[PDB]
Write an enzyme that holds these catalytic residues in place. Structure first.
Site, PDB file in Angstrom:
ATOM      1  N   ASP A 163       0.812  -1.213   0.000  1.00  0.00           N
ATOM      2  CA  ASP A 163       0.000   0.000   0.000  1.00  0.00           C
ATOM      3  C   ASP A 163       0.852   1.273   0.000  1.00  0.00           C
ATOM      4  OD1 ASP A 163      -1.795   2.054   0.375  1.00  0.00           O
ATOM      5  OD2 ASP A 163      -2.805   1.124   2.084  1.00  0.00           O
ATOM      6  N   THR A 164       1.016   1.879  -1.178  1.00  0.00           N
ATOM      7  CA  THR A 164       1.835   3.092  -1.306  1.00  0.00           C
ATOM      8  C   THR A 164       1.189   4.326  -0.663  1.00  0.00           C
ATOM      9  OG1 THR A 164       0.917   3.511  -3.507  1.00  0.00           O
ATOM     10  CG2 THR A 164       2.993   2.283  -3.400  1.00  0.00           C
ATOM     11  N   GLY A 165      -0.107   4.232  -0.385  1.00  0.00           N
ATOM     12  CA  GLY A 165      -0.811   5.294   0.325  1.00  0.00           C
ATOM     13  C   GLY A 165      -0.654   5.288   1.842  1.00  0.00           C
TER      14      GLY A 165
HETATM   15  C1  LIG Z   1     -11.102   4.323  -2.814  1.00  0.00           C
HETATM   16  C2  LIG Z   1     -11.533   2.899  -2.583  1.00  0.00           C
HETATM   17  C3  LIG Z   1     -12.620   2.387  -3.281  1.00  0.00           C
HETATM   18  C4  LIG Z   1     -13.039   1.069  -3.099  1.00  0.00           C
HETATM   19  C5  LIG Z   1     -12.398   0.194  -2.229  1.00  0.00           C
HETATM   20  C6  LIG Z   1     -11.296   0.601  -1.485  1.00  0.00           C
HETATM   21  C7  LIG Z   1     -10.611  -0.357  -0.547  1.00  0.00           C
HETATM   22  C8  LIG Z   1     -10.804   1.995  -1.644  1.00  0.00           C
HETATM   23  O1  LIG Z   1      -9.722   2.444  -0.919  1.00  0.00           O
HETATM   24  C9  LIG Z   1     -10.056   3.023   0.347  1.00  0.00           C
HETATM   25  C10 LIG Z   1      -8.839   3.304   1.192  1.00  0.00           C
HETATM   26  O2  LIG Z   1      -8.925   4.140   2.063  1.00  0.00           O
HETATM   27  N1  LIG Z   1      -7.737   2.586   0.963  1.00  0.00           N
HETATM   28  C11 LIG Z   1      -6.586   2.770   1.834  1.00  0.00           C
HETATM   29  C12 LIG Z   1      -6.038   1.438   2.357  1.00  0.00           C
HETATM   30  C13 LIG Z   1      -7.177   0.623   2.936  1.00  0.00           C
HETATM   31  C14 LIG Z   1      -7.764  -0.410   2.183  1.00  0.00           C
HETATM   32  C15 LIG Z   1      -8.826  -1.148   2.718  1.00  0.00           C
HETATM   33  C16 LIG Z   1      -9.300  -0.859   3.996  1.00  0.00           C
HETATM   34  C17 LIG Z   1      -8.710   0.167   4.747  1.00  0.00           C
HETATM   35  C18 LIG Z   1      -7.657   0.911   4.223  1.00  0.00           C
HETATM   36  C19 LIG Z   1      -5.572   3.615   1.080  1.00  0.00           C
HETATM   37  O3  LIG Z   1      -4.804   2.765   0.220  1.00  0.00           O
HETATM   38  C20 LIG Z   1      -4.736   4.393   2.066  1.00  0.00           C
HETATM   39  O4  LIG Z   1      -3.792   3.867   2.648  1.00  0.00           O
HETATM   40  N2  LIG Z   1      -5.122   5.650   2.301  1.00  0.00           N
HETATM   41  C21 LIG Z   1      -6.373   6.289   1.850  1.00  0.00           C
HETATM   42  S1  LIG Z   1      -6.445   7.859   2.618  1.00  0.00           S
HETATM   43  C22 LIG Z   1      -4.709   8.002   2.896  1.00  0.00           C
HETATM   44  C23 LIG Z   1      -4.029   8.495   1.611  1.00  0.00           C
HETATM   45  C24 LIG Z   1      -4.439   8.950   4.058  1.00  0.00           C
HETATM   46  C25 LIG Z   1      -4.268   6.549   3.097  1.00  0.00           C
HETATM   47  C26 LIG Z   1      -4.245   6.132   4.554  1.00  0.00           C
HETATM   48  O5  LIG Z   1      -5.258   5.720   5.092  1.00  0.00           O
HETATM   49  N3  LIG Z   1      -3.071   6.247   5.173  1.00  0.00           N
HETATM   50  C27 LIG Z   1      -2.955   6.136   6.610  1.00  0.00           C
HETATM   51  C28 LIG Z   1      -2.468   4.810   7.042  1.00  0.00           C
HETATM   52  C29 LIG Z   1      -2.837   3.551   6.589  1.00  0.00           C
HETATM   53  C30 LIG Z   1      -2.212   2.437   7.164  1.00  0.00           C
HETATM   54  C31 LIG Z   1      -1.229   2.573   8.159  1.00  0.00           C
HETATM   55  C32 LIG Z   1      -0.826   3.828   8.638  1.00  0.00           C
HETATM   56  C33 LIG Z   1      -1.439   4.950   8.079  1.00  0.00           C
HETATM   57  C34 LIG Z   1      -1.209   6.402   8.381  1.00  0.00           C
HETATM   58  C35 LIG Z   1      -1.849   7.061   7.154  1.00  0.00           C
HETATM   59  O6  LIG Z   1      -0.825   7.258   6.178  1.00  0.00           O
END
Ligand SMILES: Cc1cccc(C)c1OCC(=O)N[C@@H](Cc1ccccc1)[C@H](O)C(=O)N1CSC(C)(C)[C@H]1C(=O)N[C@H]1c2ccccc2C[C@H]1O
Lengths: 99, 99
Positions: free
Chosen positions: B25-27
């Protein structure tokens, strides 16, 4: 380009003639951008993230540029904490993960 | 490998003597795993994303293996809906985005 992950993979996008910053996000199925105007009809979508679910508006067949690469596809609009380019558009621009 | 993004980029990880499936997960700034036991001290932390924040326990200097690549870094443990490998470990295995 080759983008390393030491910092957030933030890029410039173009949508509706406007430049915005967005995150290349391999954990996102779909692409989600903060409140803005898009043309056409929308349909409802629920999306689930780390904190739970949010409601967004789904617009189809939207012109968008991602670091100058042209794509046409689905864009969700809603209360996302940051603009996110998800796998639906990452595949359009031919993005892969490599190690 | 080269991992395409047509589907969710799921891999098998070894952590704390256990095998788990996780999302590359690059996000995500950091790595978060569903409830499990890890050695050593921890500190509470809040992490936020779509839908808001969750409380997790932060464990430092945890060894993980992803597709034959060992790394060490911080691992967060808590009620995440999906196990997520974030940038803090992705860098260490030499993972990049390419297009
Ligand atoms: C758009 C969509 C449509 C249909 C289905 C799905 C699964 C979709 O993706 C939803 C999603 O939110 N996706 C998330 C990941 C995700 C997937 C499934 C369930 C829950 C989460 C996205 O990739 C992502 O990381 N993100 C998103 S917001 C963000 C850039 C801050 C980041 C995040 O949370 N970052 C925070 C984070 C995450 C993990 C550890 C630490 C931290 C700190 C902070 O950096």
């Amino acid at each position: 380009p080759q983008i390393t992950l030491w910092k957030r993979p933030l890029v410039t996008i173009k949508i509706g003639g406007q430049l915005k910053e967005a995150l290349l996000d391999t954990g996102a199925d779909d692409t989600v951008i903060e409140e803005m105007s898009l043309p056409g009809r929308w349909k409802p979508k629920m999306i689930g993230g780390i904190g739970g679910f949010i409601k967004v508006r789904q617009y189809d067949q939207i012109i968008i540029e991602i670091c100058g690469h042209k794509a046409i596809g689905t864009v969700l609009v809603g209360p996302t904490p940051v603009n996110i380019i998800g796998r639906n558009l990452l595949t359009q621009i031919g993005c892969t993960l490599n190690f």
